[PDB]
Amino acid sequence: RFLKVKNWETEVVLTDTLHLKSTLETGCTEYICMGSIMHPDVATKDQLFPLAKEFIDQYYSSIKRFGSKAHMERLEEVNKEIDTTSTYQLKDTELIYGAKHAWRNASRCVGRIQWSKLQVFDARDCTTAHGMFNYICNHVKYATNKGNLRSAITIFPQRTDGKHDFRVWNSQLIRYAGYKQPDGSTLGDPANVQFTEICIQQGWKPPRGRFDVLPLLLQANGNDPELFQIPPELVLEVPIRHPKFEWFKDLGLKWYGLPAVSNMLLEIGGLEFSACPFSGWYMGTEIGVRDYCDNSRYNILEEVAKKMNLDMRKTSSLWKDQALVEINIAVLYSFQSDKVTIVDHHSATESFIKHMENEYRCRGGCPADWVWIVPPMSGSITPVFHQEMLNYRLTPSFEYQPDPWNTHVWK
Amino acid sequence: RFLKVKNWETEVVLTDTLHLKSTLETGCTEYICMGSIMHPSQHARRPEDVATKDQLFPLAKEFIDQYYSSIKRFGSKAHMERLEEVNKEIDTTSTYQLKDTELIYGAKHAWRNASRCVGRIQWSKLQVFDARDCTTAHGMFNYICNHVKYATNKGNLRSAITIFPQRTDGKHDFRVWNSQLIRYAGYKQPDGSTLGDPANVQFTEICIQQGWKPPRGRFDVLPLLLQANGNDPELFQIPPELVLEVPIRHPKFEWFKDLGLKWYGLPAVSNMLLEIGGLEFSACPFSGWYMGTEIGVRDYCDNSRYNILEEVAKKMNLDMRKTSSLWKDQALVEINIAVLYSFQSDKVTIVDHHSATESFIKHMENEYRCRGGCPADWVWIVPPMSGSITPVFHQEMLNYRLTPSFEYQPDPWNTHVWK
Ligand code: HEM
Ligand code: HEM
Ligand SMILES: Cc1cc(N)nc(-c2cc(CN3CC(F)(F)C3)cc(F)c2F)c1
Ligand SMILES: Cc1cc(N)nc(-c2cc(CN3CC(F)(F)C3)cc(F)c2F)c1
């Protein structure tokens, strides 16, 4: 009835009761832990009823109206819609609550101290890819806010029969293209080579550079997706320079200011919002460690280390570690110099511990995925490394979903 | 059913069937994951104190079955006699005694099964010192000294475990009260600060309370506190010539030597329990060699350990007023360069986290290839610095509890009734 988590650095112990409210699977079993597995159909009428009730109950409990006339009538109204239309429609208040709580419940998100400050753009009246483009452009402009970034989500119409899904085919709203060259090398972001190819096949004329912002590939109502160029004045980018290394700007590095995940599914009360792009601001390591230094990504450790004149003939010189730090210093300095919101992994992990402890106080727990919360460099010098965490799946939730090109029926 | 793990760098997919042999709960469920809990489970294979026959024999049979299976017997003459022998021993002493071969097999397989250990590519190259004839803390000291000398080997370190008499009723436990054979003292200062290793403040106070005269310095090698057959523990000073230490200097920063840092070369875990076929070896000090990050990241830079980041950073003349300058990250790298440069210059075995994690990936592939799996705890395997530029960060792992195993146990001073 109670689970305890300890911080081995501070000795603080928190008591988790919230996990009793989880209902969906983590992927582990009693005899094997799948904590590091990355990824461990429409609901029928009878399936949807109890999911809707649980969510409406939770909503009315949250606003201290549980058992109220409004709670009871809403429940009856929801059951009526399910009974008649096999689905139902969230009120705006419920939509905002659900979206904020899916963020609040994202066990892999270190930025959740911000969860209650989320701008929710209801796009459930959207019917076409042009409409989605308009909503997404407004999302980008609002979220970017001339560098003073604001978290935001735009929610497109829910799934109906599974054959009319709204999807943003992009994994993120703003990403750079990748082009495989005849000689085996890759220009730009190798993570996006397949998506870049889909875009070109759909008629995108690529600049064939290292930092081409990809076009939006937007699917409405299960139709074939359509290409749209985000207006370049809406795509805020930061050239990456270094406060001490004059030569760093000569690497030609830049990144975009707005991280905007667009390939996940938002599940609220059994309803599935298959297009729900959301955005916050970057933690610097996402760019400096993963985007720039993953071997499968821009992979710049060698080039930076060369320019640092590091001894690269043996690993134990820690040349990779040395270059990695300087790169991440560069990322933070550049965003800060251009007054583009960014958070370093130390600030972000400290805030998440504060958030986590507050969540245990007021909510009874905070589901947290250590594998994802600990930054990908300098792990043990951030406080989350020493923080025991319990992982469990609460709903509303953000879910992975198959890439749309693996399932789309081309018209 | 049958589980796959993917490496997201290489796209290599491995298929795990070994997990079907797991015995103990992980702590996780279908609904909650406890993979970052230090001690998620208290599920043990044998109950409280001296087990009844229907409790110990099934575990014994299982281990003996496993051992005779390993050597292409099972059902052979010697196996069936061994079951009868173990059966008679439990009938007449409420326990049984491992053969030398079984002890060695058991110790190597506890190491092979240690999901949290990144060094297991070496698992079958393990020197086993049978100390089950030991009877006194003096004898334990003699065995541990021999272990330390053998394992240190003038810097060419060698993996070793020394196995003292198994638990009998729980009142006669052999214990090394030290957490590791070689650790530095920690002193609580009058002004509230801490001198030495703050992790060892309590154990240091116990030693001082037991007559240890501390030199009260930053790197005081602690005495051994040895408990034999349940008796009160006894202090022993490890002969310093057996304690190989490495002065930490930096290949570039000439001022780094002035920090006065050293570390010992031999990491030797002494507070764990070795469990083989229901038998519990409560004193089983084992040692290998260091991954540089254990010293340079955790020992030196944990806030509640030596916590040297600020002083190194000051010497480096870094911007320390804001986290976003990454001054901690900058010093952290130089410290770990220094640690590796120092050990290597002194020809003391050490492995950097890049080479270690690379070898562990290879070990995983080997284990899946011949064994059908390898239990691995990502949370512990990924190094505490530069995680994602190491291959294990990108390697999905499956964690499960195979026996024989190394287990945690209570610190004996919470258990011990003195005399
Ligand atoms: C406001 C500042 C935010 C920061 C600093 C932040 C930080 C992060 C980071 C560093 C990750 C890991 C990303 C990766 O490794 O690929 C992450 C994951 C995630 N974030 Fe946040 N985030 C923020 C806002 C948001 C918002 C506004 C939402 C939703 C409305 C959100 C939902 C998620 C989810 C669902 C994941 C996990 C994705 C997955 O499961 O694979 N985050 N966040
Ligand atoms: C030979 C070189 C070895 C290396 C480089 C190595 C490396 C490591 C490292 C880095 C850890 C994590 C330590 C920590 O963060 O506290 C660890 C844990 C562990 N090692 Fe190894 N190890 C080696 C040898 C051995 C041997 C010889 C044994 C036993 C015979 C062993 C058994 C274990 C166990 C049981 C753990 C987990 C401890 C726990 O759960 O608290 N290791 N190892
Ligand atoms: C809102 C937000 C803020 C922030 N700082 N990061 C992210 C963020 C999240 C992901 C995870 N996504 C799930 C997937 F596997 F599909 C990839 C990937 C990124 F690249 C990101 F930038 C998101
Ligand atoms: C044989 C060996 C080689 C090596 N490289 N490291 C270790 C090693 C393991 C631990 C785990 N300890 C048990 C605990 F949970 F208490 C913390 C702690 C250390 F300090 C170590 F050095 C052991």
Ligand SMILES: C[C@H](O)[C@H](O)[C@H]1CNc2nc(N)[nH]c(=O)c2N1
């Ligand atoms: C195999 C492992 O689960 C995978 O590499 C994870 C590790 N932790 C991560 N943590 C974050 N934040 N993002 C990631 O992509 C990953 N990848």
Ligand SMILES: C[C@H](O)[C@H](O)[C@H]1CNc2nc(N)[nH]c(=O)c2N1
């Ligand atoms: C809370 C968390 O499990 C704890 O800090 C762990 C994290 N991973 C670790 N990994 C290793 N190798 N050693 C450790 O002591 C720890 N500590």
Ligand SMILES: [Zn+2]
């Ligand atoms: Zn788990």
